Amino acid sequence: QCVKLNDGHFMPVLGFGTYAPPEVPRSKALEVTKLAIEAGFRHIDSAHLYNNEEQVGLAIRSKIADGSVKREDIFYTSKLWSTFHRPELVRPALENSLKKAQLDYVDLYLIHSPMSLKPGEELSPTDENGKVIFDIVDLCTTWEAMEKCKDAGLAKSIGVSNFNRRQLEMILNKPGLKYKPVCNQVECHPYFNRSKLLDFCKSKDIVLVAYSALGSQRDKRWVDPNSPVLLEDPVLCALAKKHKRTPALIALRYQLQRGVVVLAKSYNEQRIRQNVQVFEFQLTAEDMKAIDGLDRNLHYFNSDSFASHPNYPYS
Ligand SMILES: NC(=O)c1ccc[n+]([C@@H]2O[C@H](COP(=O)([O-])OP(=O)(O)OC[C@H]3O[C@@H](n4cnc5c(N)ncnc54)[C@H](OP(=O)(O)O)[C@@H]3O)[C@@H](O)[C@H]2O)c1
């Protein structure tokens, strides 16, 4: 199934997450994106940050060439990295992502994060103290540049990521706004279910897209190792045993039933294929309330550096 976006385009409600940490060779992104398409994924989530748009694009082209899909069957998302928020940098960044992926357009272009960073070639510009260097940019002007990308046909839809309510409001209340964001891609799972943000987005016809919906990759660079492991949650495990599914499938289906579009990363062929079985079963209303009770305001991504950013969304 798809959801209709507020610009009239459609987005598949299950997306494939493509990030893998730099210790994973890029050949793997090419391989698993092909497997995801083979399994039935049609929404593919990538980004300049991920250093994989070339491989993801090669996988899409290879599946088009063997007649598995057509380009119009694939919903490809890329994201503007935070060193490219200054408005004159936005369209060149998108064109660069398109050249690397060898695509004519993206289905969805997002502002990856509101936390602007010093412009330059470094993804993570850092000073002599090791501190990543922030930049100050009016994100309304970034948004104006995103809108020009949509008008040029390089992005079919535009949206944001990691925005809070106040940041969304800043865009929605912008004078002369042309296009609302179609979505806000945010961390969302049973330990951080974003019910308030979800209700706000629903009222504005903005789709919430959940990342780390399976509890994140627990990268030691971003995730406290003492944080509870989502997929070992005793409630999720009990519902998995009742439904003869897995905890991951319960976590994904939870999002689908509350009107959230859900991403799932896996670089494992069998788990990739497993995740598409989220469409095969339903949670009861009692099950959904049980999962609603798991919320702990737990954001897996927690960097203290970034907690000092003026646009940090969890302040
Ligand atoms: N906008 C942003 O700032 C942002 C931030 C984070 C993520 N994202 C996007 O969201 C994608 C998903 O989020 P994420 O990377 O944090 O990971 P995730 O989807 O929460 O998955 C976490 C881990 O779950 C495991 N997994 C997948 N299916 C499983 C299954 N059926 N059973 C058991 N374990 C399973 C995967 O390991 P295996 O690979 O070993 O299967 C994966 O490493 C990301 O790849 C990215 O595209 C965006």
Ligand SMILES: CCOc1ccc2c(c1)C[C@@H](C(=O)N(Cc1cc(C(=O)O)c(C)o1)Cc1cc(C(=O)O)c(C)o1)CO2
């Ligand atoms: C690893 C590359 O090196 C860098 C270097 C600088 C840098 C980032 C990554 C990412 C930025 C960012 O915004 N994230 C982190 C993120 C997103 C994804 C993805 O898969 O999309 C991954 C792998 O990491 C989201 C976020 C974190 C927090 C927090 O609280 O820490 C909040 C509120 O949002 C910050 O700047």
